[PDB]
Write a protein that binds this ligand. Structure first.
Ligand code: ZN
Length: 258
């Protein structure tokens, strides 16, 4: 049937319906910290989320998305390796069934409990749909999550998960400030890649933060109570919704720090 993260429709099967899965700039990848090249020309990231307007949270069957109003430059990302302004449209996570796995990118083969993806699109293209068709259409900020101390700013998201347990369910989710999900440092690694789930389009400039944020065991546990299935269907826990590392091939990972 359609793609998923199960044994018969998982990542290893995606290439049949989405040939680009075996493309030249697929994500995620393993970040070899010793092979990454420090680029002194990379500017600091500029995150302007003070005017962010969250609208809704939704379970789309692959993860849960927190959506924002992207009709104006309210929450934008600029600087770094980017040219122009990128508007935040949504953020979601990828996590595992155990604390030892869950992230998509890895650092020197190290896996984290989860990975947060803040998706932004290049305003020069007018809308998200047009942006995904361009090589510089999206900018995704990736943040690693490690299990330890609780993250206060994530609790509001955790508490509403019960209302969107199954696929297709959505709930009003206003006044959420994404700034509460950022680590102290904005040092990063960057490389040209793709969306990590179908359609797997190669339209992403990845910006992966070096510093992970910590969340508590209890917070991640609640992520694991979501369902891939829709209401009224056999229960399948939403866990391990991550794609394994792909070949770096003809690409170089640059670091903003040395
Ligand atoms: Zn993602």
């Amino acid at each position: 049937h359609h793609w998923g993260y199960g044994k018969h429709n998982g990542p290893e099967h995606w290439h049949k319906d989405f040939p680009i899965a075996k493309g030249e700039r697929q994500s995620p990848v393993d970040i070899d910290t010793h092979t990454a090249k420090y680029d002194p020309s990379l500017k600091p990231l500029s995150v302007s989320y003070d005017q962010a307007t969250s609208l809704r949270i939704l379970n789309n069957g692959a993860a849960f998305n927190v959506e924002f109003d992207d009709s104006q430059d309210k929450a934008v990302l600029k600087g770094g390796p980017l040219d122009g302004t990128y508007r935040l449209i949504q953020f979601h996570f990828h996590w595992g069934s155990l604390d030892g796995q869950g992230s998509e990118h890895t650092v020197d083969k190290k896996k984290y409990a989860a990975e947060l993806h803040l998706v932004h699109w290049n305003t020069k293209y007018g809308d998200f749909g047009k942006a995904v068709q361009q090589p510089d259409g999206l900018a995704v900020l990736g943040i690693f999550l490690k299990v330890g101390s609780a993250k206060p700013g994530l609790q509001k998201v955790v508490d509403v998960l019960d209302s969107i347990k199954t696929k297709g369910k959505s709930a009003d989710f206003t006044n959420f400030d994404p700034r509460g999900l950022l680590p102290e440092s904005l040092d990063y690694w960057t490389y040209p890649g793709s969306l990590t789930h179908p359609p797997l389009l190669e339209c992403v400039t990845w910006i992966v933060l070096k510093e992970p944020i910590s969340v508590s065991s209890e917070q991640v546990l609640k992520f694991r109570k979501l369902n891939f299935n829709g209401e009224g269907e056999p229960e399948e826990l939403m866990v391990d919704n991550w794609r394994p590392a792909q070949p770096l091939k003809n690409r170089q990972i640059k670091a903003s720090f040395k």
